[PDB]
Design a protein around this ligand. Structure first.
Ligand SMILES: NC(=O)CC[C@H](N)C(=O)O
Ligand SMILES: NC(=O)CC[C@H](N)C(=O)O
Ligand SMILES: NC(=O)CC[C@H](N)C(=O)O
Ligand SMILES: NC(=O)CC[C@H](N)C(=O)O
Ligand SMILES: NC(=O)CC[C@H](N)C(=O)O
Ligand SMILES: NC(=O)CC[C@H](N)C(=O)O
Ligand SMILES: NC(=O)CC[C@H](N)C(=O)O
Ligand SMILES: NC(=O)CC[C@H](N)C(=O)O
Ligand SMILES: [Mg+2]
Ligand SMILES: [Mg+2]
Ligand SMILES: [Mg+2]
Ligand SMILES: [Mg+2]
Lengths: 150, 150, 150, 150, 150, 150, 150, 150
């Protein structure tokens, strides 16, 4: 990629439905070239897709959690435990980390009860889990993972 | 919203450039109605936008961190500290949480040095910060915040 | 329930033996209506009972503890462990919680020895327990769980 | 008090509206004597009152928390901080404790937002507070503080 | 015991070889009575013995430790683990405690190597031990366990 | 000192009132020599005194604590803080330690209230104190600091 | 550098006084070329020097510590605090780290007293220090920082 | 050793290739005597070798870690676990320590991936490991283990 590709990506990361004519006018390059560049970025795996940003609040997803997981160590436990956590409905983020915990899990649910049934009751049965500590999110100050270029 | 709106959203959350004809064929409703429903969802704030999912690895964003923040308590410190953390380049997530820490921050950088200059050196000067503990992400097992409907 | 039911409950939560005539005079409604409303609240399960508030100090209950419990995780451990903790004489509160511990237990005893025999020696034998940490209450500043309406 | 007083209290602690005739029949003593004994227990401060046990769930009190507080030490900080915590609407229990924290606070609210406005935003402004850690109650297994005699 | 017994004990707790004539002169009571009182205190188990206070430094006991022990819970583990810890040469204090640890052990050795061989290597083999954390004493500010009356 | 001095000390550390004739018979040395050796040990500071071992339980000292102290760092804080802690009535041991805490304090009181007034309320006013964590002793398995030679 | 430079370095990292003839014979290259390559590595800063590995035990350096430091945050505190720690006699390693602590310090002393005077008493006066936790090394299993190529 | 040996060592610890003539001129002793003294120090094991100080950065060793290890206790676990940790490529320091952890491990790798494959994936399979916490080094302020004489 080059300087122009980054400028294109900087626009698409926050507004993917901005018309080709509008993008071409902003960056200052031929539309045909813009189309070619975007197709290449998709072909090369830089742009992996396009998603609609849906307001979780509109779906009543008010029970937001960040759970730290301590594992029972064993050969390749990170693979086994990581994948089991990733399969839980409501879990959108699973990170293998360095520190006093081994995994950080990001999840969303509508209520305390849903969270207990879909998440807590599933996690407690995973053999690779020693224990977990869930941090309830009182307020989301910022959640814009789509912004990769500042 | 109704059952049909959810099915539309379930598709748009992972593939927003799927054609109207294809979406209409999958859900089984008139294209004109589909267009109307989508426009209403955007007008009502359910769909807040459309973004291109860019592979962070393609931008060499290999230094991924999850930082826990302990604050110096004071009136409305959550607002003041939260906003200062949110303004840091590279920070995409800022959560006010319950537990032994007060904020959880998600950030991405290309290198250790960039992380130190843009993030660590900025955070250490924020008066509302007591201290922080950064968890380095060794491997991202899953990061699909776009999926709001399972 | 309505606004009037709440006012009635606000009185009964701290003084259940206040006469019907006195309550009717305070809220300003017919005694017959007050009686009907109270009976309905009991029938609907809002008022689950009436208790005498006994001063624990009068019973020499001077050894007051708040114990945090870390569990050995397993399928439905919260049910099994929670119920075993709830059965211990002297234990009045058992809460399944989010955080670095899994249960918080509230108990009262007359002495250190009674606490050790009835509580500590029982808890240490429960297989679902990894370990516990007991916080001794030096002084109860406030303990009015009966107040549900502020 | 004597053996008979304890038996009377054991009944009143869970059912204070049980008729005098019924209580007298259960314990086996004259009604006049029972009335005298109860009046004496009230006069002596053993029975401090009578309350209606209201189901918190009926009032939508679904946000239940147990907050640990670390104080900024100073002369008589336990008195000053304890009283400020006790004054917060929704807080029913405040305990000065031994251990890694100095106070344990029990509170109830209807929602996350109410909890943030009435509790979190008030606590963060108290000068005697170093920091706090809130444990969200996922499920109340038992909460019968009225039972003082097992 | 009475006021006079306490005054006698207050003297014997720090100087047991003070002559009977000197003690009688200080407290103001007949020597025969003083002798009788002391014999009674010994007979009743108040005075369990008389020891020479030996300066540990004179024996090169420079490796002073305070070890916290986390146990593997089980029926009567406090008895079993407590006794095994008490049998270790060099260990003079073993306390069953409330908090994040279960036992506190006080020990003294001449060197790091002696401490490792006699204490660490013995403790690591005790099945009731989950783990321990040893706090090395850099300086003893005060160690006068003989003073029971201030 | 020599081998004989150690054997003498091994006896005096647990029974200082054992007669000279009995000690001489046990160790096998002339009484005159034994007396000379003991006087020399006292003169050289090896034997710093003789105390009566008083059973704390006989004095109702049932509230036994081991308190960890975190200090506010500053020049020679260990001297200043250590001495202030050592002056508190009821405190018999004060140790400057390595680890997550800076001092370990051993104290004894008759009741919870005495402990709060004499110890807690005094410690909270010491400026060099950041905070403390008190571990209540449920049972003393062993407390024989007089034994220096095993 | 190339494959040959690495082989040369792999030898020099553990035996720098191995003769040129011996090194040339082992790697299989002309001595003149070996000399040229080594001089270039020194000129380019790859080889920063040559040191004698002295056995710390021979210097009675028996008090080995690894100290974790929590800082008082502020602008560029890592620079200021890091440099002050690095200036302390006996300190050979100072690392700015991610996690619950901010610096890890490696030091060596002959005795507990030397450690207290040269290290502890100096660190406690540094304003940028919140507190520290020192881990005493009981046994060095391995300490070969000179090995950079495995 | 004597005063002169220490002065010789103080020079060799940072510059082992300083010529004999230069060292003799600095310390003020005959070259023949200097040679004899150095040979004796090597023969006596004081000087265990001579190494080239290679700049780790020149080898792209940018992933620097300090890992704390909690062990599963058992007979001689320190020997077994210590040796297994010492065998891992990239690990240069292994210390058996006192405190909340049992071992501190110092290691170096070129990248996050290398660190995960060579270190993390190996450590997680060691049966004697309960868990670990890795502290990533953001900046090395000082790393001069060769300096044994200050
Ligand atoms: N999985 C491992 O090998 C160790 C992970 C652990 N969280 C650490 O930081 O060391
Ligand atoms: N900001 C506050 O009032 C408290 C926040 C803190 N993290 C807690 O869980 O209690
Ligand atoms: N039981 C579970 O699944 C987890 C409970 C744990 N206390 C937490 O907060 O995550
Ligand atoms: N307030 C105090 O003096 C100390 C209280 C502290 N929680 C402790 O356990 O020691
Ligand atoms: N042994 C037990 O039952 C619990 C002991 C633990 N240290 C506590 O404080 O709760
Ligand atoms: N006083 C100091 O300098 C440090 C003491 C601290 N407890 C430690 O272990 O490092
Ligand atoms: N200095 C900083 O900004 C933070 C350092 C802290 N140790 C962390 O891991 O976050
Ligand atoms: N290995 C042991 O016996 C105990 C080691 C532990 N790290 C401690 O400090 O006590
Ligand atoms: Mg998206
Ligand atoms: Mg009640
Ligand atoms: Mg004694
Ligand atoms: Mg070297």
């Amino acid at each position: 990629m080059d300087e122009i590709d980054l400028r294109i990506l900087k626009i698409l990361q926050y507004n993917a439905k901005y018309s080709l004519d509008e993008i071409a006018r902003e960056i200052r390059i031929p539309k045909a070239t813009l189309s070619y560049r975007i197709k290449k970025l998709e072909k090369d795996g830089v742009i992996k897709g396009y998603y609609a940003y849906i307001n979780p609040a509109s779906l009543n997803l008010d029970y937001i959690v960040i759970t730290s997981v301590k594992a029972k160590y064993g050969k390749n436990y990170h693979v086994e435990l990581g994948n089991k956590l990733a399969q839980i409905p409501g879990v959108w983020g699973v990170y293998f980390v360095l520190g006093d915990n081994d995994f950080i899990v990001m999840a969303r649910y509508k209520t305390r009860e849903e969270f207990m049934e879909k998440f807590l009751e599933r996690v407690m049965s995973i053999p690779e889990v020693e224990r977990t500590s869930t941090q309830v999110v009182v307020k989301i100050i910022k959640e814009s993972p789509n912004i990769v270029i500042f």
